[PDB]
Amino acid sequence: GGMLRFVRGNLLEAPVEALVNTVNTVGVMGKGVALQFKRAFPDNYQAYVKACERGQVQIGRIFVYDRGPLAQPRYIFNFPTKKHWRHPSRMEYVEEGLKDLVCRIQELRVRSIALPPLGAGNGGLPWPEVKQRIQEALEALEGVEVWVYEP
Ligand SMILES: [Cl-]
Ligand SMILES: [Cl-]
Ligand SMILES: [Cl-]
Numbered sequence: 258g259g260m261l262r263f264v265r266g267n268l269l270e271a272p273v274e275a276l277v278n279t280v281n282t283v284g285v286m287g288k289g290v291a292l293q294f295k296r297a298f299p300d301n302y303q304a305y306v307k308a309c310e311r312g313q314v315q316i317g318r319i320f321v322y323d324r325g326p327l328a329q330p331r332y333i334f335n336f337p338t339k340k341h342w343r344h345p346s347r348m349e350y351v352e353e354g355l356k357d358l359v360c361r362i363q364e365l366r367v368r369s370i371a372l373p374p375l376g377a378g379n380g381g382l383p384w385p386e387v388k389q390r391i392q393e394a395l396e397a398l399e400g401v402e403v404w405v406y407e408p
Contacts, residue, residue, distance in 0.1 A: 259396075259402065259403075261395055263388070265406065265407050268290070268371055268373050271406070273329075273404065274370065275334055276332070276371055277370065277371065279373055282316070282340050284309035285342045286305070287342055288342070294333065301335070314335065316340070317354060320334075320337075321361055332367065345376075345382075346376025351390065355390055355395070356394065359395065359397070362398060363398075368400060369403075
């Protein structure tokens with residue numbers, strides 16, 4: 258029963274197994290979605306900082322933090338949309354990230370996941386095009402309920 262739904266509300270409240278946080282690769286969660294994630298999920302933030310220090314966080318390479326089998330959300334999928342926090346999000350980086358998103362969902366047998374609009378909206382990437390790429394990527398997931406929070 259896989260299904261893609263586009264919704265409004267507080268991403269952090271989504272009642273799912275995995276949340277996507279939109280991040281950069283330099284180890285800063287200072288604004289926007291990432292700031293909300295830093296405040297809500299401090300252990301993910303520290304793990305993310307260490308993964309960045311190691312060079313593990315790169316374009317097309319989601320950094321997943323596991324909060325444990327009894328947690329909800331269990332996973333934080335730290336999705337890079339840009340290198341430095343001052344740079345804009347870039348469409349190529351969202352495209353490569355969405356491919357890896359599918360990879361990590363499958364690897365981890367995640368059955369429900371919620372995403373922000375991946376750098377779209379409010380002066381960022383064009384939402385119609387981002388929405389289209391999300392649809393292309395994430396309607397080819399069998400059995401996964403995907404919730405996308407609109408700009
Ligand atoms: Cl940031
Ligand atoms: Cl958020
Ligand atoms: Cl956490």
